[PDB]
Design a protein around this motif. Structure first.
Motif, mmCIF file in Angstrom:
data_model
loop_
_atom_site.group_PDB
_atom_site.id
_atom_site.type_symbol
_atom_site.label_atom_id
_atom_site.label_comp_id
_atom_site.label_asym_id
_atom_site.label_seq_id
_atom_site.Cartn_x
_atom_site.Cartn_y
_atom_site.Cartn_z
ATOM 1 N N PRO A 155 36.964 109.239 -27.057
ATOM 2 C CA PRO A 155 36.165 108.308 -26.253
ATOM 3 C C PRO A 155 36.977 107.124 -25.741
ATOM 4 C CG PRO A 155 34.974 108.913 -28.215
ATOM 5 C CD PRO A 155 36.357 109.466 -28.380
ATOM 6 N N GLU A 156 36.295 106.185 -25.097
ATOM 7 C CA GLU A 156 36.953 105.037 -24.494
ATOM 8 C C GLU A 156 37.428 104.061 -25.565
ATOM 9 O OE1 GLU A 156 38.361 101.975 -21.952
ATOM 10 O OE2 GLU A 156 38.083 104.139 -21.688
ATOM 11 N N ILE A 157 36.483 103.494 -26.311
ATOM 12 C CA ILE A 157 36.769 102.460 -27.306
ATOM 13 C C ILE A 157 37.932 102.813 -28.240
ATOM 14 C CG2 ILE A 157 35.586 100.777 -28.759
ATOM 15 C CD1 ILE A 157 32.974 102.188 -28.103
ATOM 16 N N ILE A 158 37.980 104.070 -28.673
ATOM 17 C CA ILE A 158 39.033 104.535 -29.569
ATOM 18 C C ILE A 158 40.414 104.442 -28.920
ATOM 19 C CG2 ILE A 158 39.958 106.493 -30.853
ATOM 20 C CD1 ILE A 158 37.229 107.427 -31.446
ATOM 21 N N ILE A 159 40.543 105.022 -27.730
ATOM 22 C CA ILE A 159 41.799 104.987 -26.983
ATOM 23 C C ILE A 159 42.196 103.547 -26.656
ATOM 24 C CG2 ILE A 159 42.988 105.723 -24.878
ATOM 25 C CD1 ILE A 159 42.557 107.979 -26.721
ATOM 26 N N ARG A 160 41.198 102.709 -26.402
ATOM 27 C CA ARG A 160 41.424 101.295 -26.134
ATOM 28 C C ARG A 160 42.078 100.621 -27.334
ATOM 29 N NH1 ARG A 160 36.300 97.733 -24.437
ATOM 30 N NH2 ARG A 160 36.273 99.501 -22.972
ATOM 31 N N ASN A 161 41.418 100.727 -28.484
ATOM 32 C CA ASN A 161 41.935 100.143 -29.714
ATOM 33 C C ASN A 161 43.325 100.677 -30.047
ATOM 34 O OD1 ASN A 161 41.832 98.479 -32.020
ATOM 35 N ND2 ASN A 161 41.089 100.180 -33.285
ATOM 36 N N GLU A 162 43.525 101.970 -29.808
ATOM 37 C CA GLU A 162 44.811 102.606 -30.068
ATOM 38 C C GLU A 162 45.917 102.031 -29.188
ATOM 39 O OE1 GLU A 162 47.466 104.390 -32.121
ATOM 40 O OE2 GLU A 162 45.337 104.531 -32.624
ATOM 41 N N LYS A 163 45.620 101.864 -27.902
ATOM 42 C CA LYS A 163 46.575 101.283 -26.965
ATOM 43 C C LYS A 163 46.898 99.842 -27.347
ATOM 44 C CE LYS A 163 45.511 104.094 -22.860
ATOM 45 N NZ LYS A 163 44.921 104.088 -21.492
ATOM 46 N N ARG A 164 45.876 99.094 -27.760
ATOM 47 C CA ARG A 164 46.085 97.732 -28.245
ATOM 48 C C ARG A 164 47.050 97.723 -29.423
ATOM 49 N NH1 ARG A 164 41.195 96.521 -30.186
ATOM 50 N NH2 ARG A 164 40.513 96.077 -28.041
ATOM 51 N N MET A 165 46.783 98.593 -30.393
ATOM 52 C CA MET A 165 47.641 98.726 -31.563
ATOM 53 C C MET A 165 49.075 99.076 -31.177
ATOM 54 S SD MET A 165 45.058 100.693 -34.163
ATOM 55 C CE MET A 165 46.421 101.227 -35.195
ATOM 56 N N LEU A 166 49.227 99.937 -30.176
ATOM 57 C CA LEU A 166 50.551 100.313 -29.697
ATOM 58 C C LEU A 166 51.269 99.093 -29.134
ATOM 59 C CD1 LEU A 166 52.291 102.939 -29.369
ATOM 60 C CD2 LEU A 166 51.650 102.859 -26.952
ATOM 61 N N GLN A 167 50.567 98.342 -28.289
ATOM 62 C CA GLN A 167 51.123 97.125 -27.706
ATOM 63 C C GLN A 167 51.556 96.147 -28.793
ATOM 64 O OE1 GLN A 167 51.448 96.395 -24.145
ATOM 65 N NE2 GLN A 167 52.804 94.851 -25.046
ATOM 66 N N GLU A 168 50.747 96.028 -29.843
ATOM 67 C CA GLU A 168 51.072 95.120 -30.939
ATOM 68 C C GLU A 168 52.207 95.650 -31.814
ATOM 69 O OE1 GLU A 168 48.131 93.181 -33.126
ATOM 70 O OE2 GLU A 168 46.923 92.617 -31.379
ATOM 71 N N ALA A 169 52.436 96.958 -31.762
ATOM 72 C CA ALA A 169 53.548 97.566 -32.485
ATOM 73 C C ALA A 169 54.856 97.318 -31.743
ATOM 74 C CB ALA A 169 53.313 99.055 -32.674
ATOM 75 N N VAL A 170 54.812 97.440 -30.418
ATOM 76 C CA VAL A 170 55.967 97.107 -29.588
ATOM 77 C C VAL A 170 56.277 95.618 -29.712
ATOM 78 C CG1 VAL A 170 56.902 97.001 -27.254
ATOM 79 C CG2 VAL A 170 55.500 98.946 -27.941
ATOM 80 N N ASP A 171 55.222 94.808 -29.718
ATOM 81 C CA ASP A 171 55.359 93.378 -29.942
ATOM 82 C C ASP A 171 56.036 93.121 -31.273
ATOM 83 O OD1 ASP A 171 54.233 92.712 -27.541
ATOM 84 O OD2 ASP A 171 52.240 92.285 -28.366
ATOM 85 N N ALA A 172 55.513 93.728 -32.334
ATOM 86 C CA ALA A 172 56.075 93.563 -33.671
ATOM 87 C C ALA A 172 57.552 93.953 -33.727
ATOM 88 C CB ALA A 172 55.277 94.368 -34.682
ATOM 89 N N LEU A 173 57.903 95.039 -33.044
ATOM 90 C CA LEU A 173 59.289 95.493 -33.015
ATOM 91 C C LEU A 173 60.203 94.512 -32.292
ATOM 92 C CD1 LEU A 173 61.543 97.504 -33.531
ATOM 93 C CD2 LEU A 173 60.801 98.770 -31.509
ATOM 94 N N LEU A 174 59.863 94.177 -31.051
ATOM 95 C CA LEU A 174 60.721 93.297 -30.265
ATOM 96 C C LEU A 174 60.784 91.870 -30.812
ATOM 97 C CD1 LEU A 174 60.052 94.518 -26.615
ATOM 98 C CD2 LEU A 174 61.727 95.280 -28.307
ATOM 99 N N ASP A 175 59.628 91.223 -30.919
ATOM 100 C CA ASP A 175 59.544 89.896 -31.518
ATOM 101 C C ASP A 175 58.368 89.841 -32.485
ATOM 102 O OD1 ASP A 175 59.905 87.240 -32.108
ATOM 103 O OD2 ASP A 175 59.904 86.552 -30.022
ATOM 104 N N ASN A 176 58.648 89.660 -33.769
ATOM 105 C CA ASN A 176 57.584 89.667 -34.762
ATOM 106 C C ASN A 176 57.057 88.268 -35.040
ATOM 107 O OD1 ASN A 176 55.812 90.948 -36.624
ATOM 108 N ND2 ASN A 176 57.167 90.331 -38.303
ATOM 109 N N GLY A 177 55.736 88.142 -35.061
ATOM 110 C CA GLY A 177 55.094 86.868 -35.314
ATOM 111 C C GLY A 177 54.956 86.041 -34.053
#
Ligand SMILES: Nc1ccn([C@@H]2O[C@H](COP(=O)(O)CP(=O)(O)OP(=O)(O)O)[C@@H](O)[C@H]2O)c(=O)n1
Ligand SMILES: [Mg+2]
Ligand SMILES: [Mg+2]
Ligand SMILES: [Zn+2]
Lengths: 52, 94, 104, 1112, 53, 83, 263, 96, 14, 91
Positions: free
Chosen positions: G37-59
């Motif tokens: 569904p929509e909401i699931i893929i949305r949350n997943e994409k958000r999590m992905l973005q925050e994982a890339v964020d965490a990798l490049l610059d954490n905090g």
DNA sequence: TATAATGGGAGCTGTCACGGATGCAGG
DNA sequence: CCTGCATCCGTGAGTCGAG
């Protein structure tokens, strides 16, 4: 210049039945004044055996 | 202080040029095995060992002592590098 | 050529892919029993390079006589292990992601 | 020798037990000797009482708990790397609400580490000390608004991690605001939730002009507490659906629930004392009869408004005042972590309660102790307040247990610490030492407890005083907090006394710290002793009143660094505290009751007391401390000696006849000597080494393990591939060095072989193999060898193996070998010496006895200090100590000169006059007159005005001797020093910093993983760091090639360094350096950030620094 | 340092920064020696002015 | 325009120097966007790359200086005189 | 990912960040292929973005990613590059170096302005690769490896190798440096004199320039390798060569303390 | 040259004059008096310390001194990082 | 702000 | 496994990974070990006849990296017992 | 592979001073 | 709506050694 004691491996040991440790005993042995009556005599090993 | 250092500083327009000259000369002496030295046998720097006086192993001491005598020519663009290398390889082979 | 300059600029995805020696797929490091790099893992030798100088993961080619040769068995290139400090990997995202430096 | 002591002040009470801040606290927290029903609400008992009962159905409740006996004794814990601890059992009962079935059981919760007799712990084989932590005492405080001149800020503070701080403020617009978790809201709303009505607030708060009007919001009173509760919930928690019970749960958990929000008992008491109310609980609000009933908020707001109005009887709170700061001792610090682990355990209980069979469950199946065990273990292992014990000498430990830190969890972080926090408060008097504290970053953050100071049940530091009634000083002793202290006019301890009556018309006293001269009728109390003002260490400094505080600090701190000496002597001039330190440190061994000594041995002492029972005290012998100093006890008694209660039996380390011996008493002369004492450097006599002064035994522990590898097991063996008998000589059959063998750097302590990795031998290796003819061996030589610059005689060996009874290693480990190696260190050039007055210096020269300056009678001095150290440092104590020492040399007697009640000048003049007779009159009786040299010196002294002209030479020599100065002959010339020199006995210690440990050098060695640069430290055989500033130095010098060498060949340029070493061993010039590896690391790390960094040529074309290795 | 014209190629900036910074750091960690003194305590009140400029 | 030491140091033309001082992320983003080139003019840049600093004995002024004995000089002079 | 001494494993936090990123990317792909569904893929994409964020610059945005049961924020690439412990300041602008050492300083009065006492034990290690070649030039060792294996055991060291070391350091200078180095005189070049004992002998006149006293201060020593570095050290950096402060132009090596006292 | 307690051509005077060590204020504290002290707030105690290190200090006077003593001590251990920062900034701006 | 709270909000929509 | 960034000390100063050496990359003395080994082996092979040189170096793999065999074996046994200086390389 | 179960949980509290951007009330 | 001042957010905060 040297000390050998039976049943003692090193300077840091202690002897059963003796108040002083080996280090203190050696320190006392350093205060010993030995006089050689023979000009030619370069070295002497003194022997001590005591108990009780 | 290094012997006659004031004179050595007097020879050059920049102290760093003196350093460069001394260093390069030392390298030249090392490469050719002190065969290219401008020093006389009695002018040679000596080192005191258990045996007796020998040749001073330090190439920098040599270089400065040589430089003091004025028997060396230093400057920019005296000669193309390759030609210098080859000529000195002729006169003092390794 | 002596390096006279250092240039820094953004990297296109195509460039990032042209750096990579392979895509890292599984989120795995090394095998628990063998302690060898897991295939398609973060440490995989088929991507970054051989752990030991001039030797593959399987061990078919152990010498220097083979250089640039990719073992058909374990897929490992035989070269100096130092290339594990150099060669880049990459991860292909299902959805694009904003570099936070240019955001925050 | 005789001990002659001084001082006119009679100390009424002795020093309280010095380690009690640890012992009493932890005992208070454990309550092991108190019957379970008589246990109080403090400690782990408290934790159990707060955590239980656990509900949600089933209700699991706390019945009781018990502590068992230690499965291992202290020593065995120390050897086997275990923790000294007691098993903790808990009796709990599972109760079903519906069924009613009650299943009671005792479950094992794990072990709680036990504190030893001296106040330390043993955690994983190592002695540790839990450092007491000072912080702001919880409560309600009122501080002036820094921005707004006429307004104030109310602050409601609980215990650390006991719930949120709350700020009450009067806003510019007039409304009263409240801050919780960085969110401001009008207090009117919460007050409405608490059940307050406009009537109530009007009648209560109306007395102050217009203040109450800001608290008046008609819309808030228009809604009942429920709407106000939901409104507040939406304020504090946006996006959260505003269900009623959710809001109730949130506000209850935040402001009410004692299991979440907890004030200290100190917080409760301070709230009651300040606000002038009576708190039912430790919480700000209560949930009672289904509603919210206020406790704190209204009285607090009342005090805020009263203070703002200018109502008399209201003061701001100094937050650095010691009445507002408390100490969390070991008991509290441990208790909190126990509570955390207990709450986690409760979470586990509920989580396992909801699941599983609701029928078959027992407290054993419900309770998981792992979070509790992990909490406690994490506390005693990884906490900042848990510190590796400093045992260097007894005083080290004693001081370490008395430490007070503002750092650690719950306290300050560095650069959160202002100047206010680090300052010496007027309330530190008699409580915290104004002197002792670290130099550098930790100043004011780390301090020490005063000698007479006590820490009560609330955590506040108390100091003893004496009651004075109508000019009469009673013997009644009152221990007071700072707050209590501020109430009275307190006279100084040195005020004149005839009997118990004040002998002076004008008496020096303190009112709230402010110095004032008063009449004897005004004196309410009096200081017990000057000694109460300073710490234990600071109290060990004679003539402290003559020393500057800055140097007194260092002198105080350096006694902690003094090494135990085999010849160690108590100081010639002591302060009288030297015995109590040895006693309370529990280093020395003392006789329990009266009795007769049965047996005296090196290893043990047997005593028969009046009881007739035979008591055997084993003696600790040559035990290595944490700092590597030898701690051993030596017998001070002889067979058949009659001893009383508390009489000395054996002397501990750094102890002489029950007195604290931190060093030697040496004969020193103060005078410049040939630049060898230049700038704090110290010249010593070879005769110091001859008689073994400043000689100390040091033992080092070396360790090695053999484990199981996937390539095959390592093993300890005497068979080591490719080694001569000369190398294996001192190894026994097992491969471990024999006891009593000498070891030098490079020698093998424990032989070990390891299976090589999968190895492709280069054709050259195979060639060597065939050439020598001996077949390739499966293993390689990994053996433990003596590190560079170390060595000694091997005193001990320990071997722990898997499959041995009582022996279990960490998983995978086959065996573990320890080797204890001892060495006897003399005093050498580079070793650091210091006195108690803050004079520190390294031995720069050891002269033969003939070069040393000497007295006329032939006596050479031991040490030559430089007088240039004196005038800048302004520590005059070391001068006086020397003078009194001089007399003590000739009169053959020691002295006790208490701090601030000392031996004064005239007394030392008398003593010197008496000593002069022994010094000179002996010579006059030996048939010797004054020397020509002495005549010349006396002439020069006459010109110096140091002696009165016209007097006989003897009288002048006396006049010089009363100044502590004597005629000194130069050892080399024989000619006297051109003037009289100060000479005398000084007490000097050898500190722990010895050049033997500190000397280090490296050519090449181990490199770091990522950076490929040399490691750090001597232990790692690392290189020295060339930092930004050193690079700046080279740059400023303009030495380019040196710098480039530092940046390439000597650090990370691998091709460059390999080629450099190879070129040097071949005798050629070092190669051109190439690109350093760290720049490559930088480039690749920048690439992983999706930034392309290119190295270019002058034509703007890419240059490859990876040499085609990173390019496909 | 040499009492003579500067040698070409000397790094002037580093020498300058060091020459300015050194007294600041040195005078900061020197001992205060209280009494007979009041006010802003010399070096400590001077430094923030320098950094201000 | 007058600006303080910090802002003046972050405003320098060399990105390698700036990024090694403060605000590394800022500097690096700005530079990467601009596609900045560092000509390696100053000391810090060359220090980072482990090159020879352009000062002292690394100065372009004194580093090309040659040293030759008279024999070799006249010899090269004969080789020049010949061709 | 490297096995330490104890047989256990040590690994960088970047590996954990990369693990997060890879896992979330894989899950995102699978969720896409399975028609979530929509909401699931949305949350997943958000999590992905925050994982890339965490990798490049954490905090950088939100609360920093930490390891389970730990409050320590993981180290991202940004944390690696910048900061006081960052790659730049720590590993680039300054380094730890080979051919270096340190020890406690003691004052030789008897040294000339250009000299410093260097313990034999230290110089042995500092000059080691030269000493090997010297031992090869004489009859002290068969070859280089024999010479190096010879010095590993202290009891295997004879007297002649010491004289070899004496021949090695002849004319050469070392660098003495005392931290903090406030100005360029915190490092000076000294012609070393081999001394018995473990302490470095320092000339009295250079003290004031080093701000060094005898209360237990320590100094570090370095060995310039090249004929060039030796030239720079001897000509430019020699103690006797700099007599005046580059700051005020006044003499920085001058009579002090005892000297002034006697004169 | 030597230091006795009775000094208070005098060694202190010699060392202070020549520049060997010491300055007039320290000498004054060694001899005549300590002087006024400082409350932690920055205010000043009405009672000056009338003692000198030769005479010896009362416990009260000592405790009064400790205030300014630590005020000074905290300064040196704090303000130092402010200076090194300035130095580093200067280096960074002037390095080219 | 907080990812979890956002997801819980998007969940409370259905 | 444990993190390399695991904090060592109370401060932010050093990391646990700064105390771990790199056991992979040969230190300069190891490269010098290989160099000196190949050198000493090359110079002490003077005994070799040309046929025995190529064939025995093919035996030990000194060329392409991988009866006269016996005579070369025996000659190598002969030259091993000779100079007695190669022991150092043998650990 | 099947009773029915449908919105989390901890929080870290005593620095200080700056540049730059962002926003709001006021002229 | 354009200017000016109040407020928020991010960024810094000495060196080396030892642990
Ligand atoms: N944190 C620190 C502490 C010290 N140092 C350095 O060590 C020296 C002695 O400080 P010191 O405190 O040991 C004695 P001093 O201050 O000179 O007082 P005194 O003359 O009356 O004896 C200082 O001059 C600094 O260069 C440092 O760089 N960083
Ligand atoms: Mg010092
Ligand atoms: Mg000083
Ligand atoms: Zn393969």
């Amino acid at each position: 210049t040297s000390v050998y004691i039976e049943d003692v491996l090193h300077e840091f040991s202690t002897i059963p039945g003796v108040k002083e440790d080996v280090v203190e005993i050696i320190l006392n042995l350093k205060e010993l004044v030995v006089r050689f009556l023979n000009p030619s005599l370069q070295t002497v090993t003194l022997l001590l055996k005591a108990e009780g | 202080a290094e012997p006659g250092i004031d004179k050595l500083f007097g020879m050059v327009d920049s102290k760093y040029r003196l350093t460069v000259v001394v260093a390069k000369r030392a390298q030249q002496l090392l490469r050719h095995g002190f065969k290219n030295t401008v020093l006389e046998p009695e002018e040679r720097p000596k080192m005191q060992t258990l045996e007796g006086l020998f040749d001073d192993p330090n190439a920098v001491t040599w270089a400065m002592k040589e430089l003091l005598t004025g028997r060396l020519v230093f400057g920019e663009n005296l000669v193309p590098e390759d030609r210098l290398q080859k000529e000195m390889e002729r006169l003092y082979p390794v | 050529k002596e390096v006279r300059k250092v240039r820094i600029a953004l990297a296109s995805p195509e460039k990032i892919r042209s750096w990579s020696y392979g895509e890292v797929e599984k989120p795995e490091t090394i095998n628990y029993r063998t302690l060898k790099p897991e295939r398609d893992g973060l440490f995989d030798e088929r991507i970054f390079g051989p752990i030991k100088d001039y030797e593959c993961a399987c061990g078919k080619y152990k010498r220097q006589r083979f250089e640039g040769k990719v073992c058909e068995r374990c897929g490992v290139e035989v070269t100096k292990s130092i290339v594990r400090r150099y060669r880049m990997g990459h991860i292909e995202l299902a959805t694009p992601a904003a570099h936070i430096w240019f955001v925050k | 020798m005789e001990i002659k002591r001084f001082g006119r002040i009679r100390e009424v009470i002795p020093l309280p037990p010095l380690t009690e801040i640890q012992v009493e606290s932890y005992r208070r927290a454990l309550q092991a000797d108190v019957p379970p029903e008589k246990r109080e609400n403090v400690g782990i008992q408290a934790a159990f009482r707060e955590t239980f009962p656990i509900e949600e159905g089933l209700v699991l409740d706390f019945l009781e708990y018990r502590l068992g006996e230690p499965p291992f004794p202290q020593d065995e814990c120390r050897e086997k790397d275990l923790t000294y601890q007691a098993p903790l059992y808990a009796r709990l009962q599972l109760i079903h609400k519906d069924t009613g079935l009650i299943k009671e059981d005792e479950v094992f919760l794990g072990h709680i580490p036990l504190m030893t007799e001296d106040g330390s712990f043993i955690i994983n084989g190592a002695d540790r000390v839990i450092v007491s932590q000072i912080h702001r005492s919880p409560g309600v405080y009122f501080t002036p608004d820094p921005a707004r001149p006429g307004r104030y800020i109310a602050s409601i503070i609980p215990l650390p991690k006991r719930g949120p701080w709350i700020d009450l403020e009067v806003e510019p617009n007039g409304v009263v605001s409240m801050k919780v978790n960085k969110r401001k809201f009008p207090l009117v709303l919460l007050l409405r939730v608490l059940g307050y009505d406009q009537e109530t607030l009007a009648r209560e708060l109306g007395a102050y002009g217009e203040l109450v009007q800001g608290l008046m919001d008609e819309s808030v009173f228009a809604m009942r507490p429920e709407e106000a509760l939901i409104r507040l919930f939406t304020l504090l928690r946006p996006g959260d659906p505003p269900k009623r019970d959710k809001a109730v749960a949130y506000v209850y958990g935040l402001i009410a629930d004692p299991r979440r929000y907890d004030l200290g008992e100190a917080g409760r008491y301070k709230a009651e004392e300040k606000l002038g109310i009576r708190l039912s609980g430790r919480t700000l609000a209560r949930f009672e009869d289904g509603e919210f009933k206020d406790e704190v908020f209204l009285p607090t707001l009342r005090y805020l408004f009263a203070l703002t109005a200018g109502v008399p009887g209201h003061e701001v709170d100094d937050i650095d005042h010691l009445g507002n700061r408390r100490i969390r001792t070991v008991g509290e610090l441990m208790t909190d972590q126990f509570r955390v682990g207990l709450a986690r355990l409760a979470r586990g209980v509920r989580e396992r309660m909801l699941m599983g069979s609701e029928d078959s469950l027992t407290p054993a199946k419900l309770v998981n102790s792992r979070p509790l065990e992990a909490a406690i273990r994490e506390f005693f292992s990884r906490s900042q307040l848990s510190q590796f014990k400093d045992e260097t000498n007894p005083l080290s430990s004693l001081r370490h247990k008395r430490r007070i830190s503002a750092l650690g969890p719950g306290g300050l972080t560095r650069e959160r610490a202002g100047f206010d926090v680090r300052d010496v408060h007027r309330t530190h008097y008699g409580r915290i030492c104004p002197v002792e504290t670290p130099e550098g970053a930790n100043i004011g953050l780390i301090t020490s407890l005063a000698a007479y100071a006590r820490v009560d049940e609330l955590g506040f530091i108390r100091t003893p005083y004496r009651r004075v009634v109508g000019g009469v000083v009673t013997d009644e002793v009152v221990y007071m907090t700072a707050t209590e202290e501020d109430r009275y006019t307190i006279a100084q301890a040195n005020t004149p006394l005839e009997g118990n009556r004040i002998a002076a018309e004008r008496v020096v006293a303190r009112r709230k710290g402010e110095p004032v001269i008063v009449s004897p009728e005004e004196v309410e109390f009096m200081d017990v002793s000057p000694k109460q003002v300073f710490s234990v260490n600071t109290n060990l400094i004679p003539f402290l009143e003559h020393d500057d505080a800055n140097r007194a600090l260092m002198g105080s701190n350096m006694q902690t660094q003094a090494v135990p000496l085999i010849r160690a002597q108590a100081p010639v001039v002591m302060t009288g505290l030297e015995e109590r330190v040895v006693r309370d440190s529990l280093a020395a061994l003392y006789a329990e009751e009266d009795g007769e000594v049965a047996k005296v041995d090196g290893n043990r002492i047997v005593v028969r007391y009046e009881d007739g029972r035979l008591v055997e005290y084993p003696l600790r012998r040559f035990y290595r401390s944490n700092q590597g100093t030898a701690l051993d006890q030596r017998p001070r008694v002889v067979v058949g000696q009659r001893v009383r209660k508390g009489d000395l039996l054996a002397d501990g380390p750094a102890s002489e006849n029950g007195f604290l011996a931190l060093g030697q008493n040496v004969l020193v002369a103060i005078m410049p000597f040939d630049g060898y004492n230049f700038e704090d450097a110290i010249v010593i006599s070879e005769e110091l080494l001859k008689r073994d002064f400043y000689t100390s035994i040091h033992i080092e522990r070396y360790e090695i393990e053999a484990r199981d590898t996937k390539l095959g097991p390592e093993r300890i063996t005497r068979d080591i591939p490719h080694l001569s008998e000369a190398a294996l000589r001192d190894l026994d059959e097992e491969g471990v060095v024999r006891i009593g063998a000498e070891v030098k750097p490079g020698d093998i302590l424990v032989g070990r072989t390891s299976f090589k990795g999968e190895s492709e031998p280069t054709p050259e290796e195979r060639l060597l193999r065939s050439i020598f003819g001996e077949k390739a061996r499966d293993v390689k030589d990994t053996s433990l060898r003596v590190p560079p610059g170390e060595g000694g005689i091997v005193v001990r060996t320990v071997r722990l193996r898997r499959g041995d009874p009582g022996v279990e290693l960490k998983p995978g480990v086959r065996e573990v070998v320890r080797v204890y190696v001892a060495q006897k260190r003399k005093l050498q050039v580079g070793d650091k010496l210091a006195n108690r007055h803050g004079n520190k210096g390294v031995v720069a020269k050891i002269l033969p006895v003939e070069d040393m300056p000497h007295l006329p009678d032939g006596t050479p001095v031991d040490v030559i200090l430089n007088p240039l150290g004196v005038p800048s440092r302004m520590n005059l104590g070391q001068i006086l100590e020397t003078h009194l020492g001089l007399a003590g040399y000739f009169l053959g007697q020691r002295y006790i000169s208490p701090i601030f009640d000392g031996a004064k000048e005239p007394e030392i003049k008398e003593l010197l006059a008496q000593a002069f007779e022994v010094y000179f009159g002996k010579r006059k009786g030996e048939g010797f007159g004054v020397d020509k040299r002495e005549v010349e010196v006396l002439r020069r002294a006459e010109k110096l005005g140091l002696v009165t002209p016209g007097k006989t030479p003897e009288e002048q020599l006396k006049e010089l001797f009363l100044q502590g100065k004597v005629v000194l002959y130069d050892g080399r010339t024989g000619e006297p020093i051109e003037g009289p020199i100060v000479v005398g006995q000084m007490f000097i210690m050898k500190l722990y910093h010895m050049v033997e440990d500190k000397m280090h050098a490296r050519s090449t060695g181990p490199y770091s993983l990522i950076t490929q640069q040399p490691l750090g430290g001597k232990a790692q055989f690392g290189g020295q760091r060339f930092g930004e500033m050193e690079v700046w130095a080279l740059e400023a010098y303009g030495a380019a090639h040196t710098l480039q060498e530092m940046l390439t060949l000597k650090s990370d340029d691998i091709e460059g360094r390999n080629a450099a070493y190879e070129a040097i061993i071949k005798g050629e010039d070092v190669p051109e350096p190439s690109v350093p590896e760290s720049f490559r690391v930088l480039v690749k790390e920048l690439q992983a950030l999706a930034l392309d960094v290119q190295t270019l040529d002058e034509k703007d074309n890419p240059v490859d620094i990876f040499e085609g290795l990173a390019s496909k | 340092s040499m009492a003579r014209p500067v040698s070409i190629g000397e790094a002037v900036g580093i020498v300058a920064a060091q020459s300015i910074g050194e007294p600041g750091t040195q005078l900061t960690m020197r001992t205060f020696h209280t009494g007979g003194v009041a006010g802003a305590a010399d070096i400590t009140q001077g430094l923030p002015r320098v950094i201000e400029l | 325009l007058l600006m303080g030491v910090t802002k003046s140091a972050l405003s320098t033309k060399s990105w390698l120097s700036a990024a090694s001082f403060q605000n590394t992320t800022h500097v690096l983003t700005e530079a990467a966007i601009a596609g900045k080139k560092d000509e390696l003019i100053g000391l810090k840049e060359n220090v980072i790359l482990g090159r020879l600093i352009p000062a002292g004995t690394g100065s372009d002024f004194v580093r090309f200086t040659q040293v030759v004995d008279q024999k070799t000089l006249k010899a090269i002079e004969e080789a020049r005189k010949e061709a | 990912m490297v096995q330490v001494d104890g047989g256990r494993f040590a690994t960088s936090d970047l590996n954990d960040l990369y693990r997060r990123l890879i896992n979330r990317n894989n899950r995102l792909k699978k969720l896409l292929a399975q028609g979530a569904p929509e909401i699931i893929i949305r949350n997943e994409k958000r999590m992905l973005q925050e994982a890339v964020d965490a990798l490049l610059d954490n905090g950088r945005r939100g609360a920093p990613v930490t390891n389970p049961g730990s409050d320590r924020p993981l180290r991202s690439l940004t944390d690696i590059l910048s900061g006081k412990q960052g790659r730049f300041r720590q590993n680039l602008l300054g380094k730890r170096v080979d051919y270096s050492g340190r020890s406690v300083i003691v004052v030789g009065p008897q040294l000339k302005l250009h000299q410093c006492g260097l313990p034999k034990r230290m110089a042995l290690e500092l000059f080691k690769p030269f000493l090997l070649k010297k031992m090869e030039e004489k009859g002290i060792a068969p070859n280089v490896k024999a010479a190096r294996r010879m010095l590993e055991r202290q009891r295997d060291i004879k007297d002649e190798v010491w004289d070899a070391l004496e021949e090695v350091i002849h004319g050469k200078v070392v660098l003495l440096n005392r931290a903090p180095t406030l100005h360029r005189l915190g490092i000076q070049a000294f012609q070393p004199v081999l001394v018995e004992g473990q302490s470095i002998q320092l000339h009295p006149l250079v003290c004031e320039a080093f701000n060094a006293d005898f209360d237990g201060d320590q100094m570090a020593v370095h060995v310039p390798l090249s004929s060039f570095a030796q030239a720079e050290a001897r000509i430019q950096m020699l103690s006797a060569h700099n007599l005046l402060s580059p700051a005020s132009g006044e003499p920085l090596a001058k009579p002090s303390r005892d000297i002034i006292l006697g004169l | 040259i030597t230091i006795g307690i009775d000094d208070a051509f005098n060694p202190l005077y010699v060392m202070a004059q020549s520049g060997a060590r010491g300055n007039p204020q320290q000498i004054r504290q060694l001899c005549g008096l300590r002087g006024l002290m400082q409350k932690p707030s920055g205010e000043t105690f009405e009672v000056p310390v009338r003692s000198s290190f030769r005479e010896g200090l009362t416990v009260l006077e000592y405790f009064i001194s400790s205030h300014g003593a630590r005020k000074g001590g905290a300064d040196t251990a704090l303000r130092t990082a402010d200076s090194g920062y300035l130095t580093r900034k200067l280096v960074d701006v002037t390095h080219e | 702000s907080d990812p979890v709270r956002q997801y819980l909000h998007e969940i409370g929509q259905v | 496994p444990v993190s390399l960034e695991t904090p060592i000390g109370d401060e932010k100063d050093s990391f646990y990974g700064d105390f771990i050496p790199d056991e992979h990359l040969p230190s300069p003395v190891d490269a010098a070990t290989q160099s000196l080994l190949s050198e000493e082996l090359e110079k002490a092979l003077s005994k070799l006849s040309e046929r025995e040189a190529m064939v025995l170096k093919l035996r030990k793999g000194l060329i392409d990296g991988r009866q006269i065999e016996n005579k070369a074996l025996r000659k190598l046994k002969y030259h091993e017992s000779r100079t007695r200086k190669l022991r150092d390389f043998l650990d």
